[PDB]
Amino acid sequence: AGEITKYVNPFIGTGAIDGGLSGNNYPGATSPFGMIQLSPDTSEAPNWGDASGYDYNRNTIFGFSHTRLSGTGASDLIDITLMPTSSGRTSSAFTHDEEKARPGYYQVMLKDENINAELTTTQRNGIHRYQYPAGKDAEIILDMDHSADKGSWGRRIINSQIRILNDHAVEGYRIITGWAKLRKIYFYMEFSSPILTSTLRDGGRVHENTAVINGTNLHGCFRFGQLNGKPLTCKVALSSVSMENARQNMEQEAPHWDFDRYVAAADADWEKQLGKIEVKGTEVQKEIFYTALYHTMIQPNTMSDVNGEYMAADYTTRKVANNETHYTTFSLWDTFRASHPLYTLLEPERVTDFVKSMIRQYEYYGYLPIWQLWGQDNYCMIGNHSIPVITDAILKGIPGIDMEKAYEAVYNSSVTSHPNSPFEVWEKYGFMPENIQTQSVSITLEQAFDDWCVAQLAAKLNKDADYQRFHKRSEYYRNLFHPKTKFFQSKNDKGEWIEPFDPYQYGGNGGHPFTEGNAWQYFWYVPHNIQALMELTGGTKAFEQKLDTFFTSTYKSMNHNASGFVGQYAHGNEPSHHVAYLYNFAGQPWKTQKYVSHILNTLYNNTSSGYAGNDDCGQMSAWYVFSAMGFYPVNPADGRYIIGSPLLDECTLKLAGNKEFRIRTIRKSPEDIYIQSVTLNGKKHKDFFITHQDIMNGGTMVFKMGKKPSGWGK
Amino acid sequence: AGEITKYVNPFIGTGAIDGGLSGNNYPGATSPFGMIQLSPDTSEAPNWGDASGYDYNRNTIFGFSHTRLSGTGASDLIDITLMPTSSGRTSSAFTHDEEKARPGYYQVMLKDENINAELTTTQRNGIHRYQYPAGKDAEIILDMDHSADKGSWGRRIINSQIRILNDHAVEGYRIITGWAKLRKIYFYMEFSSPILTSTLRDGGRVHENTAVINGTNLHGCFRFGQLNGKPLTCKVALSSVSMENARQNMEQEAPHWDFDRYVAAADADWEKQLGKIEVKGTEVQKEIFYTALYHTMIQPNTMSDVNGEYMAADYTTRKVANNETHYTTFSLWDTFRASHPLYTLLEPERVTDFVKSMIRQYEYYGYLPIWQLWGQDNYCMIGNHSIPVITDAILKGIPGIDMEKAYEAVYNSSVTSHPNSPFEVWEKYGFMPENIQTQSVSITLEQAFDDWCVAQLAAKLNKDADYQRFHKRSEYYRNLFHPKTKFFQSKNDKGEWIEPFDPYQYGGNGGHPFTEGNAWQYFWYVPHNIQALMELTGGTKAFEQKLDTFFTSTYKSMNHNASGFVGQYAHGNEPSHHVAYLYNFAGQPWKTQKYVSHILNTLYNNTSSGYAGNDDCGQMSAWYVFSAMGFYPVNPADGRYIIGSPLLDECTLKLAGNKEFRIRTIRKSPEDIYIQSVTLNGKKHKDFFITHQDIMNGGTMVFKMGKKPSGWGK
Numbered sequence A, B: 001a002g003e004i005t006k007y008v009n010p011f012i013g014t015g016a017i018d019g020g021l022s023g024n025n026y027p028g029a030t031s032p033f034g035m036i037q038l039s040p041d042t043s044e045a046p047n048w049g050d051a052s053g054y055d056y057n058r059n060t061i062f063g064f065s066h067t068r069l070s071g072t073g074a075s076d077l078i079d080i081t082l083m084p085t086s087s088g089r090t091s092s093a094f095t096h097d098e099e100k101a102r103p104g105y106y107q108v109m110l111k112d113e114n115i116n117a118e119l120t121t122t123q124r125n126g127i128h129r130y131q132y133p134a135g136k137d138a139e140i141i142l143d144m145d146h147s148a149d150k151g152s153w154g155r156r157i158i159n160s161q162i163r164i165l166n167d168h169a170v171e172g173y174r175i176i177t178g179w180a181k182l183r184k185i186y187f188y189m190e191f192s193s194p195i196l197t198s199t200l201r202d203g204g205r206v207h208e209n210t211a212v213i214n215g216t217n218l219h220g221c222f223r224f225g226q227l228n229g230k231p232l233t234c235k236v237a238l239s240s241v242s243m244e245n246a247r248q249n250m251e252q253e254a255p256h257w258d259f260d261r262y263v264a265a266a267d268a269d270w271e272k273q274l275g276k277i278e279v280k281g282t283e284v285q286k287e288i289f290y291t292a293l294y295h296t297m298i299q300p301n302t303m304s305d306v307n308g309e310y311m312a313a314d315y316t317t318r319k320v321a322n323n324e325t326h327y328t329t330f331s332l333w334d335t336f337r338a339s340h341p342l343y344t345l346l347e348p349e350r351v352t353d354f355v356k357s358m359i360r361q362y363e364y365y366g367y368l369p370i371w372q373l374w375g376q377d378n379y380c381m382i383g384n385h386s387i388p389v390i391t392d393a394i395l396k397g398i399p400g401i402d403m404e405k406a407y408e409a410v411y412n413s414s415v416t417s418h419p420n421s422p423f424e425v426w427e428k429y430g431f432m433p434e435n436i437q438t439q440s441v442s443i444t445l446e447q448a449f450d451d452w453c454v455a456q457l458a459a460k461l462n463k464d465a466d467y468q469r470f471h472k473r474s475e476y477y478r479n480l481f482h483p484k485t486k487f488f489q490s491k492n493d494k495g496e497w498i499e500p501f502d503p504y505q506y507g508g509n510g511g512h513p514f515t516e517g518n519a520w521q522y523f524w525y526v527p528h529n530i531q532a533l534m535e536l537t538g539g540t541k542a543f544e545q546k547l548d549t550f551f552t553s554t555y556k557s558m559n560h561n562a563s564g565f566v567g568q569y570a571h572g573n574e575p576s577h578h579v580a581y582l583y584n585f586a587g588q589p590w591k592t593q594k595y596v597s598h599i600l601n602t603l604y605n606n607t608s609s610g611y612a613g614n615d616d617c618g619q620m621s622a623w624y625v626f627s628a629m630g631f632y633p634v635n636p637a638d639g640r641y642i643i644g645s646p647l648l649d650e651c652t653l654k655l656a657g658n659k660e661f662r663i664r665t666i667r668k669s670p671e672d673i674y675i676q677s678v679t680l681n682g683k684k685h686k687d688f689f690i691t692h693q694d695i696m697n698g699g700t701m702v703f704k705m706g707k708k709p710s711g712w713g714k
Ligand SMILES: OC[C@@H]1[C@@H](O)[C@H](O)[C@H](O)c2nccn21
Pocket: A071, A072, A073, A074, A331, A333, A334, A380, A381, A516, A561, A573, A574, A614, A616
């Protein structure tokens, strides 16, 4: 018990060094792909700098809430907040010295009044256990106002309710706006001891011992008297649909009152999840690796209730079939790159539900998700990056996906214009003109890649006319390639290059042709035709040389999303993430190995500041998981993984059937970062990639490593 | 055909004279107690001065929307707006000369482009017919942004959609805030001719021939080409729950495309409704009377869909039983006085659903409605005036009401404190202190009356302890009766009379102890113990004298809700409405008859400015209906109607069974306003009231009238 789970350190990514963006992870309890993230908030109102609610540099806890995002650069959720107290207090100091976390478990001693808080979860319930000093009164404060910063996104509470049903049960809801336009969060809560007195309020309006209150700024205080020394256990279930659903969620998943038993089931559940990859390496490597793997598995989030009901993207209540689960929290601009490829390896059964969930947005909203939060699109970032995810699953043969319905959704999302996707402009110009559509160069590149995916899906279904159309569109990166400067640059609607152009200059999220990066970084974004890109650059040697400049040029111009620098390579944001693997394509695999190894060893660590930037729903972590094993999905829809440099001594992927993909290394020391040779299933392996089918068949792959570059693949 | 419906003039109450508040009625098509109010908007953004959307003093139509309130002093709804055009225009001039309206039908010639618009409805569908000139293009503009004034109530569109399903079908929705906190309006629309081209937009973002758009500021234009000379018919169904429900609403109620047939069914439906009272009088009287009766029957509004589903007050989707309908639009501060009593006479089957609907708010929200709009409370005005309505129905024996569940709702709404109802303050002080709860005197009086109702209901169910409690509370008006001045006046929490006090001074809706009136007007609000009030005033002669001062004192101090003045009596707002009947209680029935007759003949007319103030969901109209027949529910929960002065020569109420209550007059001329004697079922009638049971038994009542006061009841 705890062989693997003891390696996860939930505090990795919860802080930042001295400036530089936090990982924005949280240390509190959750379950795999769960609905509940039960965690302390170290802010009264979480914002972009502490978007999960927890910041390791802070020393005050303002309550325990039940929902949040992991690693995002904008805050939302933070719903249903409990705080223990003996004297109506709403905050407490704490120290990291008297605080612990592990998969499914969080504990902290609240110092102001010496109350011990422990947290665990099921898929849809949060479970609390609070120990008050003997001789002191036990109270719980319920805060329904506490949320992400109300000065952002037009965020306000439209309406809410707290309703005491009996001496051990409370229910309510909040309807709230924000980064997601409209969310409804219903709850059902029970206590292990009877409520003796209580107070409800809405702002300055206070009602003593009153069974219900409605309003926009609601707070409850429940008083249990002297319980010395019995702990108070609280159970809280949520739903996007109704209080009835939430109650039913509790009846099915959390009927009992054995706290330690919930803790043990969460740990067991996490041991099975993390056990999908058995690794061998140093103790620090296993900590960093299993923590990263944990970060990939805490979302997408369960949205449907145990009865299958969910709020759909048309704001109506719908129901999935009995063997299906509706998911949300799709940070797709990030997660299409590595996280979704990882789920095809470890979570094929869940991938079918992720895809079905994406398709429901098309069905009820008109196009697939761009960035999805609480069952609805918020259009964050760029592209239509459901498309690679859905394409990749289908091409790989992930079972249970209706391919014709999936194609309809992908096709219609690629021809029906919508914000940041003016498709008539796209097909008329063969690029996005900056004066018509901003973030034009980044969109042109990323959308071109989305279009390649559509083409591959059309080819699979024998839709020849569609293949031509979308293949031609996949080639529109060519229309922005400048033949003198050899960068992709912005043009206007007259077909003229905008001048002046500085390839070091950062753009934001509009008002500039690049999205949270510069032209140096976006140059590499032709993942579906690296051969064409190399040719345009002047051939393999010229392409190698440009990569060398990229990795060594230290000019600081600036966007705060960019950090974790290797020259102009910025590991802290995701446009760079595929680039270190590109030396393979240029005939210098040793340089990929050199740079990958440098990033793994130098831009990740096992402290609070352990990621180079925002984790972004586990994308930064997924990069580590992939790269540490020794390969990466450069084109996340072609079913190939490009070999880098294996960090760990061994890795074993557990697959369906009783199959295993066994990765092994022959090395003398940790200096042995260069690949001398590779074998797959006993035959010498002559390519710089392994296929998805090679992995899912089961088999074994051996790397002979060495301290010096060989001529392998060179 | 049209014997009765030809008397209704929908333009009565749609204007105002030269200042003074409009009736705020609308002339467009609707069905009895319907979901759809299909009517032109003469404003871009309706506000308090034109809250239904139509103002008779205006000459431009900005579209035809499908929802509104009748006669309210605040605007909401105004959802789903169509406008015909031949050249993308969004407004048109019109004249009353080329415009018509009658129950279930509205027509207007739009002058700018010579397009004829006709409108009718079913319970849940709006039906349009537009005739374009031969040789001109047919287009429809769909405006999803058009609404009540967005500068009030924090009103904004959270999200919306327009989605073209095929060449003849469009669906969508809007989610919007306002006077009601959150409303979701889903629609399904069909055209009689195929859409040839189209445009959708969200603000400046325009998408040509695109099947769907999402956003907060959406507009569609649909182009049908040259249809000369076939009219374009449009059908539009709504739902509070889903597009599927809306479609199903159309399939059940409006499958066909015969416009004239829809018109005829609406007229037939209205003929049965208005036929519940057959009246004889002058032609002008029948116009004023049947129009008033129409105004009482256009709300409460159907909210549940044909499958029984509705949005409940916890914002969840629920379903009523197959023989039930969920209603909303309960303007209770107004309608508890006369409109709800009228529904007990004419609409007992609907009253059961109204009561069930009120109880659903208690079940899902925690207390009964105060003022209900689109299935939720907005707390407008004062009191808990569901209570008289629910009490009155139960005491009268309206069938199908669960009395124990109803009592639970009434009781819990009377002891669970909530905004404007601090019940612990109430029971500690025996009044509302002005420094703790504003509008204190008006609330004290009205809440005292609500409490009498609870007491009567407790007595009916043999709950003796409850009877005492609420009877004692019904007497709290005594604690604000000033023994020197003989007015009800405000006190502070030390029990001290606030000074100075001016009984002419108007209050608003907070910051003053009276609600949209002065102390002169609120003095009469002890409807449940007029005997006690007369005694406190110094006896019947003193009480008579105070009424005389009230009806003759012309001092102008001012609140714009108060208008239609007879001295300090202000017919234009509803605190005054019972007062002319109080001379009966004082031993001077002839003075009631004098003043009632004066109000009927002088403060109502058959022009656009035909009401003395806001109709308030038919309360002003209900006053006319009752008073013209010759009696009024002074205490709207004791099942007595106080005799005034019958205006009409005859009236016949059609009741269940084949029963009739036949009211007849013996008179020589219209000067004969004074009652000489009364007979009921052939026996001489010695009381100044008739009972509800006397009416519902069927029978006949004869008034001998004369030009001069008799000593009848004197
Ligand atoms: O969190 C949402 C998005 C991310 O998808 C993306 O990685 C981007 O870097 C970013 N900065 C702030 C917010 N975001």
